DNA sequence: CCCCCCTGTCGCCGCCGACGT
DNA sequence: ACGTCGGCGGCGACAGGGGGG
């Protein structure tokens, strides 16, 4: 629970401070390497293949492949070119109806809250946009590199938080081409009747508790019983 | 394109072949490690703390290690007891509204493409949930990673292609810990006035058409130039 | 028949939070 | 208020293996 930013939204001259955190943790359990037989911790040393030599991290070059298999070393006016990394707000665009972004683009999502001091423009900020029920795109740019997001708010019932939903940029998303199902399927009334009890038989609400991951659990008391 | 796997959703005697793919290609340039004093692709060897000496891939084994930082030698055969990873079905568990979602969960988006000649029973299945309106709960299970998703249907121009969204557990997604804001602040009508005022100055309709990565579009036409 | 793309590691840099003045 | 210090986490790249042609 320990943040990754501070920033602020700034659409003009508003600059609310928010402090960006992870909203997704993941329990899932990271191992480690080692040589077991000698008891002996995992190292990798970056080794020339053709000269045959181990080097440092510094002297490698950020090399590109393209179909020709060649190489060429990013410089440092590649980083000069885009002045926009240097900039720690996030600078909203534009504000629209949250109906607008569709499930397919959304990638990542963090809670913002506040400097302790600015929490008034915050609330009343959030407080707008719930009330108005809009959405917030904006830009974003963490650890250098920029990606396209979007600020909407949410009520948790005690307090109200706005969060910010990272989004894919609109050509990413792949489009389904599948011509067989183009070619017409006929189907007979009576048929489609049929599965409607098939589902129904099925039915029920979405209840988060229920569902838990029985693979990583076991995993958990396993480990415990090595122990 | 390539597909990831090739199972067939299962829900008692219910039975359809799927193919899915992959929805979220990112065109983001992958580079590779080179060192300009011979200009060769970097090579990486597994080395030993302890020996001092290079330890294969096969001759490497996995460890944990815990709170106390002990290390533990963990063994395959124990850790296969799970059984389901072997399953190679969309298996469903049950149907709710789709509607009963938040986009906190949906992580990752797949396709998915009839198999046999015949789609009989995935256009009715497609038929269906579009008509009752109501997602598919699956245990998605891929790569002997089994991971929570979700079925639904959403038209695309010529087809009405189902489409299952990865989900995570819901206790993975925190919750917001924060003293901060449950403070009340006073406030006043006119602030809200003129915060609506600016607010909606600034009011627009999505138009994703224009929007694109300008960092990427630079360092694509640097390569070229280069 | 296959060569691509998940998945897991590793190493690295950059950033935050608390202690002390 | 301001300066130090240690730790935490994105992420760029590689390696391995599977299942797609």
Same mark, same amino acid.
Not at 12 to 15: F, H, R, S, W
Not at 36 to 39: L, M, R
Not at 82 to 86: C, F
Not at 208 to 212: G, I, K, M, S, V
């Given at each position: 629970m320990r943040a990754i930013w501070t920033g602020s939204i700034a659409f003009?001259?508003? @600059?609310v401070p928010v402090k960006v955190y992870s909203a997704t943790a993941d329990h899932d359990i990271r191992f480690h390497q080692v040589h &077991?037989? $000698? @008891?002996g911790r995992i190292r990798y040393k970056r080794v020339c293949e053709a000269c045959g030599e181990v080097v440092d991290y510094r002297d490698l070059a950020r090399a590109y492949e393209s179909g020709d298999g060649q190489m060429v070393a990013i410089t440092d006016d590649d980083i000069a070119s885009?002045?926009?990394? +240097?900039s720690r707000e996030i600078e909203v665009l534009e504000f629209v109806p &949250? &109906?607008?972004? $569709?499930?397919?683009?959304?990638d990542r999502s963090y809670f913002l809250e506040p400097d302790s001091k600015s929490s008034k423009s915050y609330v009343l900020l959030a407080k707008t946009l719930a009330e108005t029920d809009r959405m917030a795109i904006v830009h974003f740019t963490l650890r250098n590199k920029t990606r396209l997001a979007a600020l909407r708010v949410k009520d948790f019932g005690k307090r109200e938080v706005m969060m910010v939903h990272t989004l894919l940029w609109p050509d990413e998303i792949r489009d389904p081409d599948f011509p067989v199902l183009d070619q017409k399927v006929e189907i007979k009334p009576a048929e489609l009747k049929m599965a409607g009890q098939v589902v129904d038989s099925m039915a029920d609400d979405f209840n988060? $508790? +229920?569902?838990?991951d029985t693979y990583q659990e076991q995993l958990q008391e396993l480990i415990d019983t090595k122990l």
């Open positions: 003009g001259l508003v @600059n &077991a037989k $000698d @008891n885009l002045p926009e990394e +240097r &949250a &109906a607008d972004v $569709d499930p397919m683009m959304f988060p $508790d +229920r569902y838990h």
